[PDB]
Design a protein around this nucleic acid. Structure first.
Ligand code: NA
Ligand code: NA
Ligand SMILES: [Zn+2]
Ligand SMILES: [Zn+2]
Ligand SMILES: [Zn+2]
Ligand SMILES: [Zn+2]
Lengths: 162, 162
DNA sequence: TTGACTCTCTTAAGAGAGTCA
DNA sequence: TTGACTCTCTTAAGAGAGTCA
């Protein structure tokens, strides 16, 4: 809600509930042929999910609290960042899952950045493979690699140059 | 159904028309602090665009040919790949602009790959900065870099471990 | 046969808000 | 107040199809 005290209360309440979510260990590529371990705090697959949480889509949830008899609701991954600017360079700030695990709500696996930065982490080589993100990646992106291109650049005639 | 000859004729007509688009020289980052040159053949900003071309959206165009009284239409960037498979690994193949210049229709600047591979090139370090794309990038992606993250992973209490 | 417009849809990273009990 | 559902929207890389003359 409006007051700093109320916001801190929201963050602390959210952390307590998510702190009780099942902790699941995931072993992950770091880049450079190295492997690491992440501990994700995963929201349940079906109701009940936890105090204040409800599912609004297959892998979308919201956190709800009643303050001053008014209902305040936020995207379930956004709560750690309620005290942060909600935009940057004219772009909306988004909750960005460093572990690439949508059910995870571990705030140590989340950052707050533009949707472009967020998406781009899917192709990052990872913290031991050359990641240059200022807020460093926790793992190599799931989509990093040579790709599966069907056809490359080509022309039939002689009208074009690179 | 259009024959291979008819399809080849469509590709030849497209190349002949696009080859007359204005050719614009762009200096671009290659990665590794190096600079290169790309020559883009750019569709005009407003009508007329060229024989067979029409704008269906702000930066979307289609190419149309009528053959034996039947109207055929294709996405304007897809024509170089009409003789290629149209899906791979169960994913639709898409025209992927290696020059990251949407108005460009230079077929030497296009490849044919899944939408995920396509998008991921936005963050590639480039052909001289460590690109691992099997069909190599022509330049460093416009979104490669440290990013502009507003807040990193953090907790208020002690409920979480990484 | 052709040009110049119109509209809506896909994907996978993200969101807001309403209806009931 | 709290829980468990419903619906649609945003972005930036990509698409298909209709109307009229
Ligand atoms: Na993400
Ligand atoms: Na692209
Ligand atoms: Zn996680
Ligand atoms: Zn990274
Ligand atoms: Zn180009
Ligand atoms: Zn590349």
């Amino acid at each position: 809600a409006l007051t700093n005290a109320q916001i801190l209360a929201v963050i602390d309440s959210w952390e307590e509930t998510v702190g009780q979510f099942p902790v699941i260990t995931h072993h992950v590529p770091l880049g450079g042929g190295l492997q690491g371990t992440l501990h994700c705090y995963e929201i349940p697959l079906a109701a009940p999910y936890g105090v204040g949480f409800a599912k609004n889509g297959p892998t979308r949830w919201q956190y709800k609290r009643t303050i001053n008899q008014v209902v305040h609701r936020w995207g379930s991954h956004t709560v750690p960042f309620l005290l942060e600017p909600d935009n940057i360079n004219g772009k909306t700030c988004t909750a960005s899952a460093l572990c690439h695990n949508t059910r995870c709500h571990n705030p140590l696996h989340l950052c707050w950045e533009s949707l472009d930065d967020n998406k781009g982490r899917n192709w990052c080589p990872g913290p031991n493979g050359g990641c240059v993100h200022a807020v460093v990646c926790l793992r190599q992106g799931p989509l990093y690699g040579p790709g599966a291109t069907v056809a490359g650049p080509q022309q039939r005639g002689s009208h074009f140059v690179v």
